Design an enzyme around this catalytic site. Structure first.
Site, short mmCIF file in Angstrom:
data_model
loop_
_atom_site.label_atom_id
_atom_site.label_comp_id
_atom_site.label_asym_id
_atom_site.label_seq_id
_atom_site.Cartn_x
_atom_site.Cartn_y
_atom_site.Cartn_z
N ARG A 160 20.48 27.04 48.70
CA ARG A 160 19.62 27.91 49.54
C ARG A 160 19.30 27.27 50.90
NH1 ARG A 160 16.84 26.22 45.59
NH2 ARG A 160 15.35 24.50 45.88
N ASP A 177 17.77 23.60 56.41
CA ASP A 177 16.32 23.68 56.21
C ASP A 177 15.76 22.31 55.87
OD1 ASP A 177 14.05 25.93 55.28
OD2 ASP A 177 13.87 24.01 54.23
#
Length: 304
Positions: A160, A177
């Site tokens: 993710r 991220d």
């Protein structure tokens, strides 16, 4: 205009023996930034002035002081990382509202969604091959090696949190991220399923933490985007892993690839490989015809 909370706190950030502050970020005049479309605070496709195409991460105007400082720290972290497998920060626009961080546009989106959407299916029977997956694995391992070399512990290496430059052949995967590392620099939400036994027990983090997580990412990749530990909850996984339990190989996973996973998941951090060794193993798999000629499973669906 200028953030009083950011200016008053003025947090210093240190990476690789060098300290930076808000004054080191590249402020891009707001007039040069145009938002084009939403992509999923929130993220937009933007352009900066052939204008430069960017992803624009926005800070909600309705947010806490903590949210503001969190956004600043994210900017500082990504602006100081310098590697081809880590998303670039083009700059920031922190002197207008809502505040923006300008990032490398990653048109292929997140790796988890990509794997789920690009699974071989009767409509798209050769959408991906083993070599595509090994290239993604190598890409992220290169990013992770860079972090390890610079003594940066990511703490949430997961599909993710990885992005692709484009959907098509030639795609490059990057770590995108850094929210977990940002939170730690300055629980039902902990990424329990990516964490080694010593992390959720003693709260001890080292680079061998990211090795463990990378093993789980490898599983995510070779499973084509399944949630790790099928059918287990966070507490069930914690108990399973701390008692020596490990995931089975993904469907059709070559033995040599599964062996990288199980080395990443050694109970003692000292027995887990560093990223140099992980990259060597991935290269060996990539050169092995029996690995790369293994067919990925076809997920059943309609022709059109």
């Amino acid at each position: 205009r200028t953030s009083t909370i950011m200016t008053d706190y003025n947090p210093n950030y240190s990476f690789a023996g060098k300290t930076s502050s808000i004054s080191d970020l590249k402020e891009v005049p707001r007039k040069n930034i145009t938002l084009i479309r939403g992509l999923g605070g929130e993220v937009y496709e933007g352009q900066v002035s052939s204008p430069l195409q960017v992803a624009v991460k926005t800070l909600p105007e309705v947010c806490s002081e903590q949210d503001e400082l969190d956004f600043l720290m994210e900017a500082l972290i990504i602006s100081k990382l310098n590697h081809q497998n880590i998303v670039r920060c083009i700059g920031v626009s922190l002197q207008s509202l809502p505040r923006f961080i300008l990032l490398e546009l990653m048109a292929g989106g997140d790796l988890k969604s990509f794997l789920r959407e690009t699974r071989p299916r009767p409509s798209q029977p050769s959408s991906l091959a083993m070599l595509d997956l090994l290239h993604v694995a190598r890409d992220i391992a290169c990013g992770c090696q860079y972090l390890e070399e610079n003594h940066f512990i990511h703490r949430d290496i997961a599909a993710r949190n990885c992005l692709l430059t484009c959907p098509g052949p030639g795609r490059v995967a990057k770590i995108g991220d850094f929210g977990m590392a940002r939170d730690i620099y300055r629980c039902a939400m902990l990424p329990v399923k990516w964490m080694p036994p010593e992390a959720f027990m003693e709260g001890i983090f080292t680079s061998k933490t990211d090795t463990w997580s990378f093993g789980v990412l490898l599983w995510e990749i070779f499973s084509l985007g399944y949630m790790p530990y099928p059918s287990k909850s966070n507490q069930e996984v914690l108990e399973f892993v701390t008692s020596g339990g490990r995931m089975d190989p993904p469907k059709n996973c070559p033995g040599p690839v599964y062996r990288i996973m199980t080395q990443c998941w050694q109970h003692q951090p000292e027995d887990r490989p560093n990223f140099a060794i992980i990259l060597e193993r991935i290269e060996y798999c990539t050169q092995d015809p029996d690995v790369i000629n293994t067919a990925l499973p076809i997920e059943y669906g309609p022709l059109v």
